[PDB]
Ligand binder design. Structure first.
Ligand SMILES: N[C@@H](CCCC[NH3+])C(=O)O
Length: 235
């Protein structure tokens, strides 16, 4: 007999703790949350590591049906895509070597900044300093961090849980996180869909069900070791 077909879900699995590779498998908070959500939604699915810029290209062509990849909901992105209700709150931070004199975002003036291409961190860097060669763009956040380590850049702007977990997992790298609430906005992550997707409603209801049952907090505690503040998801 005929058919799956499965929902095709894309991701950039180079963004621990949300999605990353471990032993040939894609793991992480977004991975576990997606499984809970799609199961609650009664949707069969496949999760594919397609990379960040390809993910957006493939959503536009509808080769991929859905994405989950630590993606900030933004007004500009809503022009081209649809988002689920938010499932996480985050902010950009600055990642530097210990020893850096940087105390806030404004201290990055005249310095070289590494970011992942087409991210809200690239956006924040361009908003603060204008577009130019001092902003170095990489296809993964992993490579951005590598360019911090080897001195190719002076600082990286990326998401708080990603920077924090990198430092906590890599003490011997002697990096540090600088937070700047005055210069960086609150951000909310959403699952993402091609415009006019018939999956969004099912995913929104499933996410509600996952949060309501305590499954969201079990997953959150697995990855972060503390309770979430669920009231952040109703802002
Ligand atoms: N949350 C930021 C960074 C995500 C990058 C994930 N590879 C954004 O949506 O642009």
């Amino acid at each position: 007999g005929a058919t799956k077909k499965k929902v095709v879900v894309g991701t950039d699995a180079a963004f621990a703790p949300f999605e990353y590779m471990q032993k040939g498998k894609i793991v992480g908070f977004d991975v576990d949350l997606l499984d809970a959500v799609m199961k609650a939604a009664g949707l069969d699915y496949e999760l594919k590591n397609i990379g960040w810029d390809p993910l957006f290209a493939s959503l536009q062509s509808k080769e991929v049906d859905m994405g989950i990849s630590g993606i900030t909901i933004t007004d500009e992105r809503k022009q081209s895509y649809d988002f689920s209700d938010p499932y996480f709150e985050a902010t950009q931070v600055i990642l530097v070597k210990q020893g850096s004199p940087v105390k806030n975002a404004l201290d990055l003036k005249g310095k070289t900044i590494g970011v992942q291409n087409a991210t809200t961190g690239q956006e924040a860097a361009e908003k603060l300093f204008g577009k130019g060669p001092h902003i170095k763009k990489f296809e993964t956040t992993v490579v951005a961090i590598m360019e911090l380590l080897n001195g190719g850049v002076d600082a990286v702007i990326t998401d708080n849980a990603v920077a924090n977990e990198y430092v906590k997992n890599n003490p011997n790298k002697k990096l540090q996180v600088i937070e700047d609430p005055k210069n960086f906005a609150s951000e909310y992550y959403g699952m993402i869909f091609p415009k006019n997707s018939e999956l969004k409603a099912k995913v929104d209801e499933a996410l509600k069900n996952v949060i309501n049952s305590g499954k969201y907090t079990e997953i959150y505690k697995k990855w972060f070791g503390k309770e979430p503040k669920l009231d952040r998801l109703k802002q």
